[PDB]
Write an enzyme that holds these catalytic residues in place. Structure first.
Site, PDB file in Angstrom:
ATOM      1  N   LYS A  40      26.418 124.868 -25.932  1.00 33.56           N
ATOM      2  CA  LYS A  40      27.740 124.218 -25.969  1.00 33.56           C
ATOM      3  C   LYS A  40      28.703 124.944 -26.863  1.00 33.56           C
ATOM      4  O   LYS A  40      29.898 124.706 -26.715  1.00 33.56           O
ATOM      5  CB  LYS A  40      27.634 122.755 -26.373  1.00 33.56           C
ATOM      6  CG  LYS A  40      26.733 121.927 -25.439  1.00 33.56           C
ATOM      7  CD  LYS A  40      27.288 121.892 -24.000  1.00 33.56           C
ATOM      8  CE  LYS A  40      26.808 120.618 -23.234  1.00 33.56           C
ATOM      9  NZ  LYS A  40      25.365 120.440 -23.457  1.00 33.56           N
ATOM     10  N   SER A  51      15.027 119.678 -22.983  1.00 35.39           N
ATOM     11  CA  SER A  51      15.635 120.145 -21.726  1.00 35.39           C
ATOM     12  C   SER A  51      15.196 121.564 -21.421  1.00 35.39           C
ATOM     13  O   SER A  51      15.156 121.961 -20.243  1.00 35.39           O
ATOM     14  CB  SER A  51      17.160 120.064 -21.742  1.00 35.39           C
ATOM     15  OG  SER A  51      17.688 120.974 -22.676  1.00 35.39           O
TER      16      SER A  51
END
Lengths: 6, 307
Positions: B45, B267
């Site tokens: 991110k 993830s």
């Protein structure tokens, strides 16, 4: 009530 | 070693790729993982936080000293907090009051302000409050699930990095977990142009399989499973979807840390489990690539690494 971590 | 830079955001990107050795065997395709947690703020991110701020600045929507707002309990909040501190912006995050003290410390260490919303209202409450603050105060809202700068940055940076890293090879399959879908969409576009026979695979939680046409449901794959189809996801980019269970992903992350020395989030475990499934189907000599969005050290207080 839906949870996500983005 | 890179020459000195004037701003920490200039080291975002250029992340390394490691071939897996032990969790997949020689009878399957080779599996490579791109370590997005090597970004200076700790996750993929960083890329979208920088790109959304820089685009809004280039368009005169914001200027240094301005305040932005985003509803986020995940890595986008850390990324925006980091980039805002580095670029001289003020960040406000809305999030349910269930956030841990360590995470509050992390965001406040970068100088962010937190607006806590009712825990029982979860993300819906945070999203509503962010919109209300935007309308009341004129804050800029990056809008990670709609902002085209999100998939675009992956088209300009993450994807072309992979092309450079895989010169002299062809990539047979690229897989990525979908949170906003910007990584899959932007990388997928670049890789499909260069390698038109590549398979592009979306990864989502088995417990919240919205891309597969199912309904949102509670799941534990941090970073994935937004419960809706984001505007930033190009639903035409992927040829197939792999659903991953909570336990399968955790077991893979644990194996990868112990057997590869790669300590990544849940993830990432889901991505690697799916990439290994695809590698077994493609067979020896083929090339499968995935992305590890975040580091396992960010999740030491979840069940992921609780033995």
């Amino acid at each position: 009530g839906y949870m996500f971590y983005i | 070693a890179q020459k000195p830079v004037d701003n920490i955001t200039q080291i975002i990107g250029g992340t390394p790729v490691v071939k897996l050795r032990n969790v997949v065997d020689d009878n399957a395709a080779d599996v490579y993982v791109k370590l997005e947690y090597q970004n200076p703020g700790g996750s993929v991110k960083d890329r979208i936080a920088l790109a959304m701020i820089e685009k809004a600045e280039r368009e005169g929507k914001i200027k240094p000293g301005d305040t932005i707002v985003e509803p986020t309990s995940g890595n986008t909040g850390i990324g925006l907090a980091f980039v805002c501190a580095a670029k001289g912006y003020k960040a406000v995050f809305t999030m349910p009051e269930t956030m841990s003290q360590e995470r509050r410390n992390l965001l406040k260490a970068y100088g962010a302000e937190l607006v806590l919303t009712p825990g029982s209202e979860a993300m819906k409450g945070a999203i509503k409050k962010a919109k209300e603050l935007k309308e009341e105060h004129g804050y800029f809202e990056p809008q990670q699930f709609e902002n085209p700068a999100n998939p675009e940055v992956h088209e300009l940076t993450t994807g072309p990095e992979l092309l450079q890293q895989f010169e002299g090879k062809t990539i047979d399959a690229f897989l990525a977990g979908v949170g906003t879908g910007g990584t899959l969409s932007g990388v997928g576009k670049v890789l499909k142009k260069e390698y038109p026979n590549i398979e592009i695979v979306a990864i989502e939680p088995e417990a919240s399989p919205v891309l597969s046409g199912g309904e949102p449901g509670p799941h534990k794959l941090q970073g994935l499973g937004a419960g809706f189809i984001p505007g930033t996801l190009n639903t035409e980019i992927y040829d197939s979807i792999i659903k991953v269970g909570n336990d399968t992903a955790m077991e893979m992350s644990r194996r990868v840390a112990k057997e590869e020395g790669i300590l990544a989030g849940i993830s990432s475990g889901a991505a690697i489990y799916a990439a290994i499934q695809k590698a077994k189907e493609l067979g020896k000599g083929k090339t499968v690539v995935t992305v590890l969005p975040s580091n396992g050290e960010r999740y030491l207080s979840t069940p992921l690494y609780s033995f």
